[PDB]
Amino acid sequence: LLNMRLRNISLKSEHCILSSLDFQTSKASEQLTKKFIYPQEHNSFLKLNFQEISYKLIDGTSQIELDPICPLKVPLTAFSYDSISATFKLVLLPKSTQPHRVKITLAYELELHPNLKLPVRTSWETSLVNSKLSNVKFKFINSNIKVIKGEKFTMRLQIINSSSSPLDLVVYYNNTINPITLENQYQLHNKYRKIAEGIILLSNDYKIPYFADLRFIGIMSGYYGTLSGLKVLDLNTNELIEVGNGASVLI
Amino acid sequence: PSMDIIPLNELFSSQVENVDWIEYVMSKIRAESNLHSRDFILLLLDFRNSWIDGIKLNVQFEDFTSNEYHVEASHTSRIIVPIKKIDYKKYNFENTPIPRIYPGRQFIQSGLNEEQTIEMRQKFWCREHIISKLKCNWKLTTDQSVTGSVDFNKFIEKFDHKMVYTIYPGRLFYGVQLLLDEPKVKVGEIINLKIITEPTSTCRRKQNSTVNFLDIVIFDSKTSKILPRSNRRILYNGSLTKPISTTKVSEINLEIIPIEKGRYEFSVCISKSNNQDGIIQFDSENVILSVI
Amino acid sequence: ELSAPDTRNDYNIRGDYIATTPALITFDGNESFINCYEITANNNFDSKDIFNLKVRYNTLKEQLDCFITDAVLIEGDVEWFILFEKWKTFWELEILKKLKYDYDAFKENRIIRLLKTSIDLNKTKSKIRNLCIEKAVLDKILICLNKVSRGIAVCNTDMDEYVRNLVPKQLTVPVQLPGFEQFFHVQFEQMETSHDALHDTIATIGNSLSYTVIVENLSGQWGQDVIDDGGYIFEILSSNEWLIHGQKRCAIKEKRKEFEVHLIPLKKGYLNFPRVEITNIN
Structure with a gap:
């Protein structure tokens, strides 16, 4: 309940289904932490996303992105990363797992520590x-x-x-x-x-x-x-x- | 056995100067600035032998001489020949084709109307033009001294409505060109345009409606023409209906200022009234500009 | 025409439509008459001036009525010497109930009357002292105009200096936005399908509200679709807005937004407020 996440999957014709996950800081959590931060006179938050990764299957393999990604940190934003799955001619639906690490750093170097991990099936x-x-x-x-x-x-x-x-x-x-x-x-x-x-x-x-x-x-x-x-x-x-x-x- | 006639509109810029017709047509376009593109028509005729030996089949037009092809035993090989159009105002195509004899009465009450006779005269005299320059002078590859000519009179059968449009522009309803000042104009500038219109000798066919309506369409050079709100596009004074009249050298001069991009092509359309499905001629002169 | 106010900046209205050669238009809401003006912005920011226009016009009913009067019953000066100079107001009172057919007057016909009354008009002209030297012409002209059609030629020849043009005006205050921005992005497309040769649009449009945002749409692609995921880097210059996209995909819907009307605003820097967001995918 700090950054709402959704995954969108599309089916390219070149036998490679592309699935993109999107992350966005939810507005209710934004106002929830924002009034308590602006009590201490803070306008922009700092959620440090330092380790974002996606895993494959019952044996965990880390499929990479389609481009580079650094360790970023911003407030009131949204970002989407796209991985390329393999197109399946059969009816075996792949079930993947994703994980993130949001460091919700309150000011004067007094940071909390949050981590999250979703797991679902990459249907289309x-x-x-x-x-x-x-x-x-x-x-x-x-x-x-x-x-x-x-x-x-x-x-x-x-x-x-x-x-x-x-x-x-x-x-x-x-x-x-x-x-x-x-x-x-x-x-x-x-x-x-x-x-x-x-x-x-x-x-x-x-x-x-x-x-x-x-x-x-x-x-x-x-x-x-x-x-x-x-x-x-x-x-x-x-x-x-x-x-x-x-x-x-x-x- | 068959024949078809197709025009062309691209300019054919060079390094494609190995194909036999292209150097001749682009040489005629290249100098002599009145000898323009957009009015050349290629005729596509298919030579097919019924023999056991190869042939060479060079085709000679009145000045166009083709290359040396090779038809082996039973194949077709479409030899593509350029020809220009035939000008309707310079010629006359409404005289009866003569018979050879002057003896028989030939059933002198001829069973034909006016317009069927005139389209029969057009259909005969167009192939009378295109046969009286066309030649071929063949030779066998393995015998080399059996060189003979051919005719074309027992091979071309008749025309249809498509050939008499494509060869003869007098069958159309109006004759249009366009005049544009600057095709490389910057966006903050308004440019005068010109549409010359010169009607035909098929203006006799209607004889009652003395007005026809020149529509204007605009298309991004790719596809998918722009709806007449024309935002992000040509900002245009006036409106695109512009009435013209029969037997008039009118000039519907307009103005055009761009907004965003470069690749624009301009053309017209004739629609004979203002209602839906009154349309007669999908005119296709289709000249182009750019805006940096 | 168009007129510039007393503030008198360097507004250069190059657009100025004069219908000199055609005395023609139609506004029957089937086609679309568009007039447009290529103005210029001021020497600095200027957002509220007043513009007033000048449309001369007529209406086509008295255009065809002027044509019918000047070339159907009063063509020569011989009949205009006596037969209509003593009954001109009576001719206007007869002409005002003509009601010519303006539904087939825009399709291959002009000066063509409708199915209005012509029976008791002869009795009404015979009731007064209208002489037969004018009652022959005023009946023959209506009998001719009951079934006749003219063309677009010889319409300006009757319209020339025989119509009072009601030079109307309006008011256009050249409305403006509120939140100026100035941004420029750059893209680098990681190709799913090799290249689909997309067509571009570098937009320039500003959002004018409170607690608002600026929403952008991607470029238009026209080959094999559903692909060509474009990565991007912002360099959101000359402000501090909030961004809400990273490494999108140029298919059916991406909507790379940018929350703008939250902090670090400015004033009206131009004619309106602007946001000249020029993307450059090289």
Whole structure:
């Protein structure tokens, strides 16, 4: 009851859940010690946090922070430190423990000594393109973020199919404007315009035959996150697989 | 088998001077300051052999000569050719294409209206322009003396509405450029702007509504245009509706003073009335400035 | 127009809108008319002066009524010699009940009347001594204006020096804040995802209350989100405030606050009170 603490956990896409703990001197404790300190004419407190650490599991391992941290001391403040946990594909929820050491130094070198230790579970409170029909999956083997200029470049698809008939699909980019509140109308027009002529495929209408190298050239500068022009058509039972993957900046 | 025509808007600064069209188009842009960018259109046509041996397939335009490609046996290889636009006011595209004979009556009650005839004349005479300069002069790699030419007349089939927009700007409704004084202006300064407007020969199509409404939109160079409250942004006198008229060389000159940042692009929009969904032309001249 | 008071500082209002070439506006609350003024601060701090404006205007009803009078029934001076110079006030009393359609007058039409009465107006003109040399023109003009539409051209040609412009005014006292601050921070982003190429905003805004605080929002990122945790070091210059954040994260919500209105305040150091918090993440 001197510094209220909370922990926030987020799930990054790079298979590393990041959990950040936040500490803040609570206002009720602030006024509680503040009137008794201002009786002796003190305006700013001094809670010296000298040893803050987090532990892992039933065997205690000290996972470090993401940056440096000295031994600080301040009043009426808040500070947050972020550790990087490991992403779990199973349903084993990791339970961690944190500990601090607040030295509540009253003045003229007459200090008290306080320590605290919480322990809880680091929950989070709740791409590979796959089709809807068959076993056919898509994933770009080369890193989906890429930094290019407006020059010629290459990109690499990959197909994991049912081995019964691996062939009979075609790719094409469809360089035409999709046929569409004037402000939202023109915003959707600018999205559909810079999609339809931003990059151009240097081999479209292209029969596939488990790799498939397909080669572009990029014209217009900008970050094309989930570049969604190119559209792999499946010949038999005529449907379309969108490929919402890959993101190329062109600067 | 197929063909498509796409324009370009980036300037293509150098060290990308290895790709065959880029040096020619940037050479024409580079000197001759009236020979500007933003109006070049690339045509994308795909050569595909049905043979057993490789070919070389050099493409000659009226002055553009491409590199030496290599199509092996059954593949496509999209050879990208630059071409400028064709000016509507300099030319005439509303005359009937002639027949060869003068003998037959040819069912002289022709079953066509006015506007269907005129769009048929446009669709024919645009490919009449783009065929009468295009060539190719091929050779086999393993035989080297079997060099022949090709035609293009039995290959290009027809156009659609997208090709006649992209090749011919006379199909559009207005012709606009922009004039800006200083593209590197400091923030405490107000700069006059200019929007020239020059209507088309498709102004005959409506003939009744003698006003159209030039909207103004503003977008951060990245994405996601700014709502017209324009705080932290361009501080602007007047309002962005600015009525213009048919058959007029009007100039809706405005003023613009920045607040925070640099990367701004300016463009227009034509909407034919003031209500929702009256829109006709999403005009896209889209010039840029900076504020340090 | 805009006018500067008698205190007479170096206020440089570069903004001054003159609608010389257009005699046109509309205020039907569909689009948004914004006027703006690029003023300047004084030679020192100056927080309470008085500004008064000058809007000339008209209303569009008597704009189209002036157009209809000057080019529908009194175009030439031949009819203006006799047929309307003896019944001008009667023409105004007839014109005041015209009630032209101002709902389709902003969409491809101008000077177009609504469905108002035109039957008993002929009987009302016939009741007085109105001669047929004017009763033909005053009926034919209303019959023409019952279904006609003009354009934006030849509107200023009727509006030119034929309208009393009510040059109204207002009062704008150029309101000010209370607690001046001057801070500058610096960041160093420990990258979770490599860089998301964020777009920046160096704010300048002051909080004006008592027992209050200054709350800041981080920069805006537009690539792959939820990441790029930015570390920071304060160097909170020229004051002694209270800080309430350390080594935040540039995702969905960070809100790196700074409790300001507690101790070590100052006066109005400028036109308003300021806090020119310029972060610099290099």
